[PDB]
Subunit: 160 residues, 3 copies
């Protein structure tokens, strides 16, 4: 129906505990929708929240790739230098083929906005036929990151 | 005689099965020759073809590194997002020391020509005293990648 | 007293054996001190020398992280293509969370100075609450690397 199935995983002790809301989730979802055309037609069909714990992250990534077979998973948060940030360690354990080019573009564009970009430790890669991309928690982040990738993500999903 | 020994490994189900020809092999070959002076005097003494299967790739990288002692092995193909592209996985299993600097440079220059460059998953590094660099299947690809690296590849082979 | 504790590890067969002196150690030293303000108040409290041998580098990395609890360890040398350069390999075995962004920035800025930059194989990452960054052995190197990081290294140590 929707061709490319996207899922978004918000990572955040605060949100997961119900101690605060998700401000970045909704922004991402909406960027994806707004980019559907240029993405080759894609839609978000699922979101979830988990705390900052690797096992918790690992599971969802496994589930959504092996069982639900999503095409594109974006994670938000837990990619910084704080000790609780372990999204990338969780992500590196489940991908099979790395995609450094994506990381390279995300790091290049974001460094044009600000140097603090050097603090993302985002990972990315493919598992089965799911592309997974770690992104930062800021609400505007997703917007800028997606702008950077959109010129090729289409061909990227097709090739998978 | 020739000082730097170069070997070129083409990776491609089609080509290895005899179903089609190698267009990229012979461009790479000639780019190396035409860069010999600037490379410190180098020449290509061997080429092969294998299909897209890690074991087939690992074996040659092993053999040509540990038994034939090539100084420089370029691989062509099997670096995209397609499921059969497994060259980088295979290369990661046989190198001992990474040289991200080279990837950084290849990714930078090629992004200037097109965004689709973010889709290489190229790997590289050293095994014993062999430098190994993955490159893309396109015939012009080798020409542009090499242009990017030649300013330093010479000091690189010498330091090894 | 000093807030950010900094330690500098010089990596170098020649120095460690008493056969020549350390010219890089002391520039790094003074760069850090000269950047204390902008770094959030930091000071270099220890230095050491070891040869080019992974064990010897691992142990100090381990020790200064797990026992002395440094906040920032800069290494110098052993990051090139020469067979003895094994600093990155040693660093990669002791870190727990990579920080590619820092490698990214270092590599970008030095490329602007010269292409030979492409020959650093530096690694970097966090272990416990210690940030570790490999740097090149040249004396000016540390000055340039730091200039590239300073804008964020402060936020970086604070987050850890």
């Amino acid at each position: 129906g929707p061709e490319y199935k996207v899922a978004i995983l918000t990572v955040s002790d605060t949100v997961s505990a119900g101690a605060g809301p998700d401000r970045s989730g909704p922004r991402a979802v909406s960027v994806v929708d707004s980019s559907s055309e240029k993405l080759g037609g894609a839609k978000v069909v699922a979101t979830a929240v988990v705390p900052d714990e690797v096992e918790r992250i690992k599971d969802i990534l496994q589930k959504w790739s092996d069982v639900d077979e999503m095409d594109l998973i974006l994670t938000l948060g837990g990619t910084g230098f704080t000790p609780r940030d372990v999204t990338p360690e969780a992500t590196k354990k489940v991908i099979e083929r790395e995609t450094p080019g994506l990381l390279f573009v995300m790091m290049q564009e974001s460094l044009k906005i600000t140097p603090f970009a050097m603090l993302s430790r985002s990972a990315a890669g493919i598992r089965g036929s799911t592309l997974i991309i770690n992104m930062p928690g800021n609400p505007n982040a997703v917007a800028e990151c997606m702008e950077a990738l959109l010129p090729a993500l289409k061909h990227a999903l097709k090739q998978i």
